[PDB]
């Protein structure tokens, strides 16, 4: 089940019961899709990452709140990049709690973005209604602050930008990346979660554990 906006720049696809994937196309150098999650809980909507900017983020929020007729209460920022923290301003003005590690908050500030909470520790478990969410900082990789999100009830891993999609042959922006450490961080994810079912890459189609292996291959 996929749902879009008249424009086709924002779409949400059902992964499981209360887990949907939101994807927005940014307009640069042209369309680059970015993934996030929408968690439909008994106490509101929880998102994993916002969008490229405030306009897209606001549109995304308006779309899901209308679809599920609920308030987006929290958002987990996986790292300080436009495709993830781009709509932080929209979040703060709507009373949406922007969770992040202290490091992500520090880098967000350094990059001219409003500051997220900086509340997430290396391992943080959050439960919204009956929806369980675990955030984990595996170490430096795509960026210094990148974290992954794990949904234990579904064994779904949001690898975010630390994980490349099956068709990706490029690592993307590595100016802020720690290429040599990237591999170790992915192994920490692989060692921590040994029963991964679905894996959501930062960009591209949902896959499985093979995406992490594919990324390690690109890094060799
Ligand atoms: Zn990034
Ligand atoms: Zn990205």
Swiss-Prot record:
Gene3D superfamilies: Ribonuclease Z/Hydroxyacylglutathione hydrolase-like. Inhibited by captopril stereoisomers and iodoacetate. Also inhibited by chelating agents such as EDTA. InterPro entries: BcII-like_MBL-B1, Beta-lactamase_class-B_CS, Metallo-B-lactamas, NDM-1-like, RibonucZ/Hydroxyglut_hydro. It catalyses: a beta-lactam + H2O = a substituted beta-amino acid. It is found in: Periplasm. Substrate binds at residues 164, 173. GO terms for molecular function: beta-lactamase activity; zinc ion binding. GO terms for biological process: antibiotic catabolic process; response to antibiotic. The keyword Ribonucleoprotein does not apply. The keyword Cell membrane does not apply. Its EC number is 3.5.2.6. Zn(2+) 2 binds at residues 83, 161, 203. Its cofactor is Zn(2+). Keywords: Antibiotic resistance, Hydrolase, Metal-binding, Periplasm, Signal, Zinc. Belongs to the metallo-beta-lactamase superfamily. Class-B beta-lactamase family. This is Metallo-beta-lactamase type 2. It comes from Bacillus cereus.
């Amino acid at each position: 089940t996929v749902i879009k906006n008249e424009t086709g720049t924002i779409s949400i696809s059902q992964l499981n019961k209360n887990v949907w994937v939101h994807t927005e196309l940014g307009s640069f150098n042209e369309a680059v899709p970015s993934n996030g999650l929408v968690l439909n809980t008994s106490k509101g909507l929880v998102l994993v990452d916002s969008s490229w900017d405030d306009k897209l983020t606001k549109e995304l929020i308006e779309m899901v709140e209308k679809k599920f007729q609920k308030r987006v209460t929290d958002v987990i920022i996986t790292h300080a990049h436009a495709d993830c923290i781009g709509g932080i301003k929209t979040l703060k003005e709507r009373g949406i709690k922007a969770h992040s590690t202290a490091l992500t908050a520090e880098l967000a500030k350094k990059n001219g973005y409003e500051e997220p909470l900086g509340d997430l520790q290396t391992v943080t478990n959050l439960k919204f209604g009956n929806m369980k969410v675990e955030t984990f900082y595996p170490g430096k990789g795509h960026t210094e602050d990148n974290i992954v999100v794990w949904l234990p009830q579904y064994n779904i891993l949001v690898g975010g930008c630390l994980v490349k999609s099956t068709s990706a042959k490029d690592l993307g922006n590595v100016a802020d990346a720690y290429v040599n450490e990237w591999s170790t961080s992915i192994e920490n994810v692989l060692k921590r979660y040994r029963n991964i079912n679905a894996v959501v890459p930062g960009h591209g189609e949902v896959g499985d554990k093979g995406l992490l292996l594919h990324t390690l291959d690109l890094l060799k």
